[PDB]
Amino acid sequence: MKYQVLTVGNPNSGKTTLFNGLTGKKTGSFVHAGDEFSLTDLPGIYALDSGNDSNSIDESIASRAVLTHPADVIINVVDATCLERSLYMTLQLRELRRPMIVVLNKMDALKRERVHLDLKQLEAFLGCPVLALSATNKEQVRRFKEKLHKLLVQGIALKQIELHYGAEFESLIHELEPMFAEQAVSARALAIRALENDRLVINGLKEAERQNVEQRQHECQVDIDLLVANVRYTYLHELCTHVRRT
Ligand SMILES: Nc1nc2c(ncn2[C@@H]2O[C@H](COP(=O)(O)OP(=O)(O)O)[C@@H](O)[C@H]2O)c(=O)[nH]1
Ligand SMILES: [Cl-]
Ligand SMILES: [Cl-]
């Protein structure tokens, strides 16, 4: 009866459009088929990260909320025109294993560029529901409400992405997953972030557990940021060639 919906995506992905279309950093609600929907439009971010460099306070707030804000579902709004760039965050959302839908927006611009994308198999690799849309189109957004409501009542079925970082990094992950098994979010996902040196995860930790984590970042023989960038990029690129066709 009362659902919390987070809107998350890159800047210029269409978030504010789809938020305004549904409801009538911005907050709002609507009703559909006898249930209530509290919507939140989180600021545009490109990764689930904050901290010293990621100066913008807005980005930290978005990162923090995705990490900790209550949510029945996170709507990942993805600009279908720059598909590969946007999907990097999508991967990280998937590693959180929070309930989530991908919304390919700006589909109108894509079909006038003679690009057809295999949303069926795109769904197969992300392992979460994938929806196509043009948020400026009133009819499709209303159709989107019915689709979203149905999913929330039916429950969202998720299979986790086959994302593998190589034996060493995988070992460091399974070393740190212990101290995250209680959290609302995948211990693996938080373990990966801790090796990635995410201020949000790390500062949450006990003084002891904090000095565990960076003991592992010295253990790693390759640059952690170099490894995750390559692995996610490779995965992304293979997927795009499989799903994008002309
Ligand atoms: N062609 C096309 N343009 C869109 C669509 N949705 C949004 N836009 C445009 O892309 C820009 C996105 O703005 P906005 O919704 O604020 O993106 P935000 O930065 O994520 O909040 C706006 O100028 C929109 O008019 C769409 O489905 N198709
Ligand atoms: Cl209910
Ligand atoms: Cl692309």
CSV table of C-alpha atoms and ligand atoms in Angstrom, one decimal:
chain,number,residue,atom,x,y,z
A,1,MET,CA,0.0,0.0,0.0
A,2,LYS,CA,2.8,2.6,0.6
A,3,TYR,CA,5.9,2.2,-1.6
A,4,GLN,CA,9.2,4.1,-1.4
A,5,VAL,CA,10.7,4.7,-4.8
A,6,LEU,CA,14.2,6.1,-5.4
A,7,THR,CA,15.1,7.6,-8.7
A,8,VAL,CA,18.8,7.1,-9.5
A,9,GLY,CA,20.7,7.8,-12.7
A,10,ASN,CA,23.4,9.9,-14.5
A,11,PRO,CA,22.9,13.6,-15.0
A,12,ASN,CA,20.8,14.3,-18.1
A,13,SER,CA,19.4,10.8,-18.1
A,14,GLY,CA,15.9,12.1,-17.8
A,15,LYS,CA,15.3,11.6,-14.0
A,16,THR,CA,13.6,15.0,-13.5
A,17,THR,CA,11.4,14.4,-16.5
A,18,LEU,CA,10.2,11.0,-15.4
A,19,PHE,CA,9.8,12.3,-11.8
A,20,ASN,CA,7.6,15.1,-12.9
A,21,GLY,CA,5.6,12.9,-15.3
A,22,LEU,CA,4.7,10.5,-12.5
A,23,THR,CA,4.0,12.9,-9.7
A,24,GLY,CA,1.8,15.3,-11.7
A,25,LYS,CA,17.0,16.5,-5.1
A,26,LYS,CA,13.2,16.6,-5.4
A,27,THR,CA,10.5,14.6,-3.5
A,28,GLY,CA,6.9,13.7,-4.3
A,29,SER,CA,4.2,11.2,-4.3
A,30,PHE,CA,1.3,9.8,-6.4
A,31,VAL,CA,-1.3,7.1,-6.2
A,32,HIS,CA,-2.2,4.3,-8.5
A,33,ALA,CA,-4.7,1.4,-8.3
A,34,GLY,CA,-5.3,2.0,-4.6
A,35,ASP,CA,-1.6,2.2,-3.5
A,36,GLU,CA,0.6,5.1,-2.6
A,37,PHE,CA,4.1,5.8,-4.0
A,38,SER,CA,6.6,8.1,-2.3
A,39,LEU,CA,9.1,9.2,-5.0
A,40,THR,CA,12.6,10.6,-4.5
A,41,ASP,CA,14.7,12.1,-7.3
A,42,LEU,CA,18.3,11.7,-6.2
A,43,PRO,CA,20.9,14.0,-7.7
A,44,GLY,CA,22.7,12.8,-10.8
A,45,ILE,CA,25.8,10.7,-10.1
A,46,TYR,CA,28.0,8.6,-12.3
A,47,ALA,CA,29.1,6.1,-9.6
A,48,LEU,CA,27.9,5.1,-6.1
A,49,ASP,CA,30.7,7.2,-4.6
A,50,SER,CA,31.6,10.3,-2.5
A,51,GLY,CA,34.5,11.3,-0.3
A,52,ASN,CA,37.3,13.8,-0.6
A,53,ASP,CA,37.6,14.0,-4.4
A,54,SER,CA,33.9,13.5,-5.1
A,55,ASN,CA,33.6,17.0,-3.7
A,56,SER,CA,30.0,17.7,-4.6
A,57,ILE,CA,27.9,17.5,-1.4
A,58,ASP,CA,24.9,16.6,-3.7
A,59,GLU,CA,26.7,13.5,-5.0
A,60,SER,CA,27.6,12.4,-1.5
A,61,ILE,CA,23.9,12.7,-0.5
A,62,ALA,CA,22.9,10.6,-3.5
A,63,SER,CA,25.6,8.0,-2.7
A,64,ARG,CA,24.5,8.0,1.0
A,65,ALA,CA,20.8,7.6,0.2
A,66,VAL,CA,21.3,4.8,-2.3
A,67,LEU,CA,23.4,3.1,0.4
A,68,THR,CA,20.9,3.7,3.3
A,69,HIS,CA,17.7,5.4,2.2
A,70,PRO,CA,14.7,3.0,2.6
A,71,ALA,CA,13.5,1.8,-0.8
A,72,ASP,CA,11.1,-0.7,-2.1
A,73,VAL,CA,12.8,-0.3,-5.5
A,74,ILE,CA,15.5,1.8,-7.1
A,75,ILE,CA,14.6,3.1,-10.5
A,76,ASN,CA,17.8,3.2,-12.5
A,77,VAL,CA,17.2,5.8,-15.2
A,78,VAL,CA,19.6,5.1,-18.0
A,79,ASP,CA,20.1,7.2,-21.1
A,80,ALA,CA,19.8,4.7,-24.0
A,81,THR,CA,21.7,7.0,-26.3
A,82,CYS,CA,24.9,6.9,-24.2
A,83,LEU,CA,24.2,3.3,-23.1
A,84,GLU,CA,27.7,2.1,-22.3
A,85,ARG,CA,28.7,5.1,-20.1
A,86,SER,CA,25.5,4.9,-18.0
A,87,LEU,CA,25.5,1.2,-17.3
A,88,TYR,CA,28.6,1.3,-15.2
A,89,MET,CA,26.5,2.5,-12.2
A,90,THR,CA,23.9,0.0,-13.1
A,91,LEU,CA,26.5,-2.7,-12.5
A,92,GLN,CA,27.2,-1.3,-9.0
A,93,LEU,CA,23.5,-1.1,-8.2
A,94,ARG,CA,23.2,-4.8,-9.2
A,95,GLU,CA,26.0,-5.7,-6.9
A,96,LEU,CA,24.1,-4.1,-4.1
A,97,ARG,CA,21.3,-6.6,-4.9
A,98,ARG,CA,18.7,-4.1,-3.8
A,99,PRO,CA,15.4,-4.4,-5.7
A,100,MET,CA,15.8,-2.3,-8.8
A,101,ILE,CA,14.5,-1.6,-12.3
A,102,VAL,CA,16.4,-0.2,-15.3
A,103,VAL,CA,14.5,2.3,-17.3
A,104,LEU,CA,15.9,3.0,-20.7
A,105,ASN,CA,14.9,6.5,-21.4
A,106,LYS,CA,15.3,8.6,-24.5
A,107,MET,CA,14.3,5.7,-26.7
A,108,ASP,CA,12.7,8.1,-29.2
A,109,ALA,CA,16.1,9.6,-29.9
A,110,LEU,CA,17.6,6.1,-30.3
A,111,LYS,CA,15.2,4.8,-33.0
A,112,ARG,CA,15.8,7.9,-35.1
A,113,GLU,CA,19.5,7.0,-34.9
A,114,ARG,CA,18.8,3.5,-36.4
A,115,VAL,CA,19.8,1.6,-33.2
A,116,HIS,CA,17.8,-1.4,-32.1
A,117,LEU,CA,18.9,-2.9,-28.7
A,118,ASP,CA,18.1,-6.4,-27.5
A,119,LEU,CA,16.4,-5.4,-24.3
A,120,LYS,CA,15.5,-9.1,-23.8
A,121,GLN,CA,19.1,-10.2,-23.5
A,122,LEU,CA,20.1,-7.0,-21.9
A,123,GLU,CA,17.8,-8.1,-19.2
A,124,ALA,CA,19.5,-11.5,-19.2
A,125,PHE,CA,22.9,-10.0,-18.5
A,126,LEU,CA,21.9,-7.5,-15.9
A,127,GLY,CA,19.5,-10.0,-14.3
A,128,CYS,CA,16.9,-7.3,-13.3
A,129,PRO,CA,13.8,-6.0,-15.1
A,130,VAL,CA,14.6,-3.7,-18.0
A,131,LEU,CA,12.1,-1.2,-19.3
A,132,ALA,CA,12.1,1.0,-22.4
A,133,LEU,CA,10.6,4.4,-22.4
A,134,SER,CA,10.4,8.0,-23.6
A,135,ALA,CA,9.7,10.1,-20.5
A,136,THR,CA,8.5,13.0,-22.5
A,137,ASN,CA,5.7,10.8,-23.9
A,138,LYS,CA,2.7,11.0,-21.5
A,139,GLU,CA,1.1,7.7,-22.5
A,140,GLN,CA,4.3,5.7,-22.0
A,141,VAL,CA,4.8,7.1,-18.5
A,142,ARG,CA,1.3,6.2,-17.5
A,143,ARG,CA,1.9,2.7,-19.0
A,144,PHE,CA,5.1,2.8,-16.9
A,145,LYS,CA,3.1,3.3,-13.7
A,146,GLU,CA,1.1,0.2,-14.4
A,147,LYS,CA,4.3,-1.7,-15.1
A,148,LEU,CA,6.0,-0.5,-12.0
A,149,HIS,CA,3.0,-1.1,-9.7
A,150,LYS,CA,2.6,-4.6,-11.0
A,151,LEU,CA,6.2,-5.3,-10.3
A,152,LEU,CA,6.0,-4.0,-6.8
A,153,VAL,CA,3.1,-6.3,-6.0
A,154,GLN,CA,4.4,-9.2,-7.9
A,155,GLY,CA,7.8,-8.8,-6.3
A,156,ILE,CA,10.9,-8.1,-8.4
A,157,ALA,CA,12.8,-11.3,-9.5
A,158,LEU,CA,16.6,-10.8,-9.5
A,159,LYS,CA,19.5,-12.9,-10.6
A,160,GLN,CA,23.0,-11.5,-9.7
A,161,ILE,CA,25.4,-10.4,-12.4
A,162,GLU,CA,28.3,-12.8,-13.2
A,163,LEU,CA,30.9,-10.1,-12.4
A,164,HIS,CA,34.3,-11.6,-11.5
A,165,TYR,CA,37.4,-9.7,-10.6
A,166,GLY,CA,40.1,-12.3,-10.6
A,167,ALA,CA,41.4,-14.6,-7.9
A,168,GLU,CA,43.4,-12.1,-5.9
A,169,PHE,CA,40.7,-9.4,-5.7
A,170,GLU,CA,38.1,-12.1,-5.2
A,171,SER,CA,40.1,-13.4,-2.2
A,172,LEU,CA,40.3,-9.9,-0.7
A,173,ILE,CA,36.5,-9.6,-1.2
A,174,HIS,CA,35.7,-12.9,0.6
A,175,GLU,CA,38.1,-11.7,3.4
A,176,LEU,CA,36.0,-8.6,4.1
A,177,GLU,CA,32.5,-9.9,3.4
A,178,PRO,CA,32.5,-11.2,7.0
A,179,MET,CA,32.1,-7.8,8.5
A,180,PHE,CA,29.2,-6.8,6.2
A,181,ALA,CA,26.9,-9.9,6.5
A,182,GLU,CA,24.4,-7.9,8.6
A,183,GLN,CA,23.9,-4.9,6.4
A,184,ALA,CA,20.9,-4.1,4.2
A,185,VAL,CA,23.1,-4.3,1.1
A,186,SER,CA,25.2,-7.2,-0.3
A,187,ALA,CA,28.2,-7.8,1.9
A,188,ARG,CA,30.1,-8.5,-1.3
A,189,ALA,CA,29.1,-5.1,-2.7
A,190,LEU,CA,30.2,-3.3,0.4
A,191,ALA,CA,33.4,-5.4,0.5
A,192,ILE,CA,34.2,-4.3,-3.1
A,193,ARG,CA,33.6,-0.7,-2.1
A,194,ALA,CA,35.9,-0.9,1.0
A,195,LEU,CA,38.7,-2.2,-1.3
A,196,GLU,CA,37.7,0.6,-3.7
A,197,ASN,CA,38.2,2.9,-0.7
A,198,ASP,CA,34.7,4.3,-0.4
A,199,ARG,CA,34.5,6.8,2.4
A,200,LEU,CA,30.8,6.1,3.0
A,201,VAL,CA,31.3,2.4,3.8
A,202,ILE,CA,34.7,2.7,5.5
A,203,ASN,CA,33.7,5.5,7.9
A,204,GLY,CA,30.8,3.4,9.1
A,205,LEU,CA,33.1,0.7,10.4
A,206,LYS,CA,34.5,0.1,13.8
A,207,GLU,CA,38.0,1.5,14.4
A,208,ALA,CA,39.2,-2.1,14.4
A,209,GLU,CA,37.4,-3.2,11.2
A,210,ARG,CA,38.6,0.0,9.5
A,211,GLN,CA,42.2,-1.0,10.1
A,212,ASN,CA,41.4,-4.4,8.7
A,213,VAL,CA,40.3,-3.0,5.4
A,214,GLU,CA,43.3,-1.0,4.3
A,215,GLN,CA,45.5,-3.9,5.4
A,216,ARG,CA,44.1,-5.6,2.3
A,217,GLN,CA,44.6,-2.7,-0.1
A,218,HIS,CA,48.3,-3.1,0.5
A,219,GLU,CA,48.0,-6.9,0.0
A,220,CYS,CA,46.8,-6.4,-3.5
A,221,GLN,CA,49.6,-6.5,-6.1
A,222,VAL,CA,47.7,-4.5,-8.8
A,223,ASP,CA,46.0,-1.1,-8.5
A,224,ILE,CA,42.5,-1.8,-7.2
A,225,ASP,CA,41.0,1.1,-9.1
A,226,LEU,CA,42.7,-0.1,-12.3
A,227,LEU,CA,41.3,-3.7,-11.8
A,228,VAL,CA,37.7,-2.8,-11.2
A,229,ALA,CA,37.7,-0.3,-14.0
A,230,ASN,CA,38.9,-2.8,-16.5
A,231,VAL,CA,36.6,-5.7,-15.3
A,232,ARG,CA,33.5,-3.5,-15.3
A,233,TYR,CA,34.5,-1.9,-18.6
A,234,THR,CA,35.2,-5.3,-20.3
A,235,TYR,CA,31.8,-6.7,-19.1
A,236,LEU,CA,30.0,-3.6,-20.3
A,237,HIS,CA,31.7,-3.6,-23.7
A,238,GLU,CA,30.9,-7.3,-24.4
A,239,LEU,CA,27.3,-6.7,-23.4
A,240,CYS,CA,26.9,-3.7,-25.7
A,241,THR,CA,28.2,-5.6,-28.7
A,242,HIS,CA,25.8,-8.5,-27.9
A,243,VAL,CA,22.7,-6.2,-27.4
A,244,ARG,CA,23.3,-3.2,-29.7
A,245,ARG,CA,22.6,-3.9,-33.4
A,246,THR,CA,21.9,-1.9,-36.5
B,1,LIG,N1,14.5,12.7,-26.9
B,1,LIG,C1,14.2,12.6,-25.6
B,1,LIG,N2,14.7,13.5,-24.7
B,1,LIG,C2,14.4,13.4,-23.4
B,1,LIG,C3,13.7,12.3,-22.9
B,1,LIG,N3,13.6,12.5,-21.6
B,1,LIG,C4,14.2,13.6,-21.3
B,1,LIG,N4,14.7,14.2,-22.4
B,1,LIG,C5,15.5,15.5,-22.4
B,1,LIG,O1,16.7,15.3,-21.8
B,1,LIG,C6,16.9,16.2,-20.8
B,1,LIG,C7,16.9,15.5,-19.5
B,1,LIG,O2,16.5,16.4,-18.5
B,1,LIG,P1,16.2,15.9,-17.0
B,1,LIG,O3,15.0,15.0,-17.0
B,1,LIG,O4,16.3,17.0,-16.0
B,1,LIG,O5,17.5,14.9,-16.8
B,1,LIG,P2,18.1,14.7,-15.3
B,1,LIG,O6,19.4,15.5,-15.3
B,1,LIG,O7,18.4,13.3,-15.0
B,1,LIG,O8,17.2,15.3,-14.2
B,1,LIG,C8,15.8,17.3,-20.9
B,1,LIG,O9,16.2,18.4,-21.7
B,1,LIG,C9,14.7,16.5,-21.6
B,1,LIG,O10,13.8,17.4,-22.3
B,1,LIG,C10,13.2,11.3,-23.9
B,1,LIG,O11,12.6,10.3,-23.6
B,1,LIG,N5,13.5,11.5,-25.2
B,2,CL,CL,1.2,-3.8,0.4
B,3,CL,CL,26.9,2.5,-26.2
